[PDB]
């Protein structure tokens with residue numbers, strides 16, 4: 001809703017003030033959701049291509065991250081049968097599908113050559129865990145606080161690297177490798193594995209050099225905790241245990257604690273690697289209810305992470321399929337619907353491409369939000385969020401961007417999906433525009 | 447889970463550093479949940495008393511806040527029929543039940559004489575709203591951005607004060623009065639009413655002096671937003687509109703944004719007035735899964751709010767009844783179970799009573815959390831949370847508490863519910879103790 005009233009906001013953007021390097025937005029096809037995106041029954045191949053294109057085409061959804069589950073379940077793992085001991089031999093199996101995640105990754109890469117693939121294990125194979133199963137939590141055999149018949153840490157590291165090798169041989173580079181999912185949480189009934197930061201360091205001291213020996217440019221994550229506070233606690237313990245230099249990227253989920261402050265690592269970026277409305281019905285609205293599933297709220301959640309926790313990437317849970325509101329694109333039979341959450345993603349990532357750097361942006365009005373990003377080639381994005389219920393006349397002072405010639409204005413609200421509204425020449429360093437209520441307006445400077 | 451390892455933590459507590467004044471913990475019986483706690487069949491009257499005592503007895507749950515819905519629905523409102531215009535006559539009705547909330551409040555007061563009652567409207571009567579119904583959001587007629595036939599603001603203020611008068615005539619003092627619930631959110635199907643901060647100020651400028659004339663010590667809240675960020679935006683706008691001194695307490699819910707920083711108001715306390723696991727099954731465990739419903743997680747959520755957003759009070763959603771995990775005590779027939787979330791509440795509020803002041807407390811270990819509270823009468827509570835998975839030997843240095851002579855130690859973990867562990871004489875200003883893994887240990891100084 002909105003009403004007639006106009007106020008003003010002053011914004012200053014300063015390319016001399018520089019923060020994090022951005023990675024992008026993304027989603028997962030884990031647990032067979034990639035097969036709902038690529039079913040070859042119901043959704044036609046034309047429509048499966050279109051759905052993936054909507055997500056990963058720079059000009060539409062703008063996404064760049066595909067997060068794949070290194071599976072550990074019957075029929076989803078590269079190690080369906082384990083050797084008796086870590087001496088092996090190991091019989092690795094690749095079916096060219098990987099629960100259709102290979103299809104998802106290959107197709108996303110077709111539409112986005114800058115794809116950032118995150119291979120993330122939810123559990124080790126059960127044979128290398130205290131509980132003897134990929135379900136029900138438990139620990140990698142060989143970290144402190146375990147008493148298994150053998151130390152399986154090297155074997156688990158080698159297994160993760162082999163998964164990466166399968167994708168490399170198909171011509172797909174992995175960008176990030178993770179060995180846990182939500183290690184602070186035991187869901188019991190599906191792939192899971194628990195850890196504190198001391199036990200995590202006990203594994204990372206083996207994983208990290210093993211990875212760099214095979215793939216010197218492959219980054220290692222830690223540790224996909226359920227929330228920001230749980231991640232900070234694991235990060236503290238990893239560093240306390242001596243493992244500061246055994247991971248490269250802090251990864252965390254937004255389910256069980258959300259941050260308003262940075263993470264407790266120096267010199268490492270962070271990615272929010274999973275979040276969704278896990279309980280509500282399928283939803284597409286931008287700003288009708290004010291509920292957390294809506295697109296405008298996701299624009300605001302992302303602004304908070306990028307400006308207050310210096311976050312470099314942001315992932316929905318699933319890309320496309322069933323699962324009610326857990327996807328960005330809902331698929332039923334040969335039909336699909338796009339949630340306006342994707343246009344919140346696009347408002348950031350259609351314009352701030354991988355390698356862009358967040359730069360200084362301030363607003364004189366608390367709920368007229370602004371951030372700004374400078375691409376490697378010097379183009380600049382300024383996504384402004386008018387979270388108020390009436391229009392704001394904004395004035396944007398540009399510092400450090402004198403080499404800019406043109407400005408294009410894009411709008412997302414209840415009747416606009418990143419719509420091009422205006423294009424003008426830049427004849428000074430000041431932008432003036434009226435931002436509609438409850439909207440994201442992106443100023444694209446070239 | 448835990449393992450064998452011991453590390454140490456240094457803690458410093460300083461009564462010379464002083465923060466917020468505490469109000470307490472509590473819950474609601476709105477929407478008929480008080481009638482599930484006091485039912486006409488099933489739970490016996492003796493068990494109804496016992497459930498209320500478990501919540502509000504200082505020695506058990508330690509809660510002090512009862513949050514009541516000033517109802518607006520057929521059968522639950524003090525204004526069953528509206529006059530045609532704000533001139534009235536208003537035919538107010540008091541049935542002495544208030545959807546059993548009177549019984550909840552009167553029984554809670556019997557177990558806690560310091561009960562802090564928060565009377566909170568979810569919506570104005572439909573006749574005073576733009577939408578003509580208590581459901582489906584909409585605005586108080588007469589705030590900016592409305593074009594109703596009449597300005598109903600004074601009438602709504604008088605109606606809220608009359609509700610308070612009915613309670614005060616029955617011998618129950620109301621401590622806080624709120625005119626909206628989640629004004630950033632429209633659930634459509636139940637009592638709701640929307641507002642931005644400008645519109646809220648337009649009503650608060652009438653409600654506030656109306657309230658203080660009738661009840662000079664009755665505090666006014668604003669505005670029970672669905673999350674911390676939504677509350678900050680409304681508070682910004684109320685103050686931008688000129689309304690800084692038309693409310694007394696900032697109220698907010700933890701559903702759609704959680705804080706790690708203070709709220710944007712000077713000289714006013716804040717209360718987190720509603721949160722719960724809205725979707726999961728009924729749950730009582732302390733630390734088995736690591737899921738957000740668990741008692742240990744709630745202890746940590748409260749620590750975060752009290753130490754990082756200076757929060758003075760904390761409410762579950764419902765007190766007791768059905769509704770899966772939305773209650774602190776589940777009732778089925780003549781049986782009940784208590785969630786260990788209640789022992790997280792007690793770890794703070796059994797010992798930090800109304801009027802206590804949060805004092806300085808630091809820990810040398812990130813996930814050994816500490817806070818500290820000084821009661822008006824000089825006793826001090828120090829709730830330490832060992833969020834690690836092994837025991838910590840803590841050393842607590844006490845500054846500014848020379849005149850305390852005794853310490854009692856209370857423990858909550860998977861096998862203890864605020865159990866008295868030890869009582870010792872206080873020699874010197876140094877406490878030493880081993881805090882078990884995944885536990886809240888309270889040091890009670892007298």
Ligand SMILES: *[C@@H]1O[C@H](CO)[C@@H](O[C@@H]2O[C@H](CO)[C@@H](O[C@@H]3O[C@H](CO[C@H]4O[C@H](CO[C@H]5O[C@H](CO)[C@@H](O)[C@H](O)[C@@H]5O[C@H]5O[C@H](CO)[C@@H](O)[C@H](O)[C@@H]5O)[C@@H](O)[C@H](O[C@H]5O[C@H](CO)[C@@H](O)[C@H](O)[C@@H]5O[C@H]5O[C@H](CO)[C@@H](O)[C@H](O)[C@@H]5O)[C@@H]4O)[C@@H](O)[C@H](O[C@H]4O[C@H](CO)[C@@H](O)[C@H](O)[C@@H]4O[C@H]4O[C@H](CO)[C@@H](O)[C@H](O)[C@@H]4O[C@H]4O[C@H](CO)[C@@H](O)[C@H](O)[C@@H]4O)[C@@H]3O)[C@H](O)[C@H]2NC(C)=O)[C@H](O)[C@H]1NC(C)=O
Nearest residue numbers: 504505506556557558799821823825854863864865866892
């Ligand atoms: C400051 O401040 C603070 C805070 O506030 C404080 O403190 C506090 O105080 C309060 C007041 O006083 C209190 O309360 C109270 O209480 C009571 C009871 O008591 C009892 O109990 C308790 C508890 O117990 C439990 O716990 C424990 C621990 O753990 C254990 O051990 C036990 O066994 C138990 O257990 C159980 O339970 C639990 C839960 O609870 C569980 O968990 C478990 O498991 C189990 O089950 C206790 O504590 C006590 O004891 C104590 O004390 C005694 C004396 O009495 C002694 O002898 C002992 O020894 C002890 O002490 C020790 O310890 C402790 C701990 O425990 C420590 O702390 C110390 O220090 C020492 O060391 C007992 O046993 C009650 O009764 C009360 O009530 C009342 O009041 C109310 C209000 O307030 C009301 O409502 C009610 O109703 C009543 O009323 C009545 O009374 C009054 C007076 O009293 C009046 O006024 C009225 O009117 C009425 O009257 C009527 O009635 C009567 C009778 O009663 C008659 O007589 C007449 O005539 C008429 O008819 C109260 O509530 C609390 O407790 C406290 N806290 C703490 C923590 O401590 C302080 O004090 C201050 N200070 C200053 C200086 O000021």
Ligand SMILES: *[C@@H]1O[C@H](CO)[C@@H](O[C@@H]2O[C@H](CO)[C@@H](O[C@@H]3O[C@H](CO[C@H]4O[C@H](CO[C@H]5O[C@H](CO)[C@@H](O)[C@H](O)[C@@H]5O[C@H]5O[C@H](CO)[C@@H](O)[C@H](O)[C@@H]5O)[C@@H](O)[C@H](O[C@H]5O[C@H](CO)[C@@H](O)[C@H](O)[C@@H]5O)[C@@H]4O)[C@@H](O)[C@H](O[C@H]4O[C@H](CO)[C@@H](O)[C@H](O)[C@@H]4O[C@H]4O[C@H](CO)[C@@H](O)[C@H](O)[C@@H]4O)[C@@H]3O)[C@H](O)[C@H]2NC(C)=O)[C@H](O)[C@H]1NC(C)=O
Nearest residue numbers: 058059060110111112113351353375377379417418419420
């Ligand atoms: C600095 O970095 C910047 C960031 O990267 C960079 O900007 C971006 O550059 C890239 C690379 O060039 C651009 O991406 C290309 O886009 C081509 C299509 O371009 C045309 O369509 C665009 C989108 O059009 C929609 O949106 C507009 C804005 O709302 C509307 O006006 C349109 O009507 C249209 O709307 C429809 O779709 C919307 C969703 O998209 C929807 O909301 C709406 O409702 C409606 O449905 C237009 O922006 C663009 O228009 C501009 O350019 C034309 C000139 O062509 C002008 O006439 C226009 O007036 C306007 O100025 C175009 O119309 C793609 O074809 C291209 O694909 C190729 O490349 C990718 C990989 O990048 C491959 O995967 C793909 O297969 C293609 O490969 C083929 O070609 C390449 C060479 O092109 C070759 O190498 C390869 O081997 C193969 O042969 C690519 O995706 C991106 O659009 C730019 N973004 C922005 C925001 O501008 C910037 O240029 C850099 N600057 C410098 C100096 O380096």
Ligand SMILES: *[C@@H]1O[C@H](CO)[C@@H](O[C@@H]2O[C@H](CO)[C@@H](O[C@@H]3O[C@H](CO[C@H]4O[C@H](CO)[C@@H](O)[C@H](O[C@H]5O[C@H](CO)[C@@H](O)[C@H](O)[C@@H]5O)[C@@H]4O)[C@@H](O)[C@H](O[C@H]4O[C@H](CO)[C@@H](O)[C@H](O)[C@@H]4O)[C@@H]3O)[C@H](O)[C@H]2NC(C)=O)[C@H](O)[C@H]1NC(C)=O
Nearest residue numbers: 728730731732778781782783784785786789860861862863
């Ligand atoms: C400290 O504080 C804690 C927290 O309050 C107290 O611990 C809790 O106590 C309550 C009761 O006071 C417990 O609830 C009861 O649990 C028992 C045990 O159930 C378990 O074991 C059974 C085998 O003996 C098993 O059958 C159960 O499994 C069934 O039920 C679960 C429910 O989740 C379901 O998921 C399964 O699929 C099964 O269907 C379970 O594993 C249980 O038997 C009790 O049932 C009785 O009462 C209920 C009414 O509540 C009634 O409906 C039943 O028919 C039956 O009459 C009841 O559920 C609770 O589990 C405890 N929680 C924890 C974390 O321990 C603790 O007691 C306090 N300490 C002290 C000293 O007081």
Ligand SMILES: *[C@@H]1O[C@H](CO)[C@@H](O[C@@H]2O[C@H](CO)[C@@H](O[C@@H]3O[C@H](CO[C@H]4O[C@H](CO)[C@@H](O)[C@H](O)[C@@H]4O)[C@@H](O)[C@H](O[C@H]4O[C@H](CO)[C@@H](O)[C@H](O)[C@@H]4O)[C@@H]3O)[C@H](O)[C@H]2NC(C)=O)[C@H](O)[C@H]1NC(C)=O
Nearest residue numbers: 284285286332335336337338339340341343414415416417
């Ligand atoms: C900008 O981006 C937004 C967000 O992606 C787009 O808006 C969404 O568009 C989709 C379709 O692409 C909409 O989904 C469709 O909504 C229709 C309306 O549903 C309402 O009204 C009917 C009428 O009775 C009710 O039955 C229903 O419950 C709703 O109240 C539906 O009719 C559509 O149903 C279709 O699919 C189902 C599949 O089971 C079939 O049963 C039907 O027969 C039919 O084939 C569908 O659900 C969605 O509502 C839009 N959301 C919003 C917030 O607008 C914009 O289109 C896009 N802009 C542009 C220009 O493209």
Ligand SMILES: *[C@@H]1O[C@H](CO)[C@@H](O[C@@H]2O[C@H](CO)[C@@H](O)[C@H](O)[C@H]2NC(C)=O)[C@H](O)[C@H]1NC(C)=O
Nearest residue numbers: 280281282283284285288289290291292293294
């Ligand atoms: C999420 O978005 C959906 C649409 O994708 C909204 O669906 C509406 O549902 C109500 C019934 O609950 C219908 O009367 C409307 O016609 C639906 N709208 C449309 C456009 O189809 C749903 O309300 C949204 N939920 C939230 C919480 O915002």
Ligand SMILES: *[C@@H]1O[C@H](CO)[C@@H](O[C@@H]2O[C@H](CO)[C@@H](O)[C@H](O)[C@H]2NC(C)=O)[C@H](O)[C@H]1NC(C)=O
Nearest residue numbers: 726727728729730731734735736737738739740
């Ligand atoms: C919340 O607490 C309940 C107990 O109140 C836990 O219940 C267990 O549920 C599983 C199935 O999900 C049963 O097999 C167990 O027997 C139950 N335990 C008991 C003691 O009844 C439940 O697991 C907890 N949920 C979370 C997420 O922690």
Ligand SMILES: *[C@@H]1O[C@H](CO)[C@@H](O)[C@H](O)[C@H]1NC(C)=O
Nearest residue numbers: 038039040096097100102103
């Ligand atoms: C997935 O890709 C493989 C080869 O990469 C192909 O054989 C198979 O048909 C694809 N599956 C779907 C459902 O598109």
Ligand SMILES: *[C@@H]1O[C@H](CO)[C@@H](O)[C@H](O)[C@H]1NC(C)=O
Nearest residue numbers: 144145146147148149150450
């Ligand atoms: C570990 O397990 C083996 C085999 O059960 C047992 O012999 C050994 O004592 C255990 N180690 C410890 C330290 O308990």
Ligand SMILES: *[C@@H]1O[C@H](CO)[C@@H](O)[C@H](O)[C@H]1NC(C)=O
Nearest residue numbers: 484485486542543546548549
């Ligand atoms: C509510 O309180 C009155 C007076 O104490 C009592 O008579 C009535 O039975 C109570 N109602 C219920 C449902 O317990």
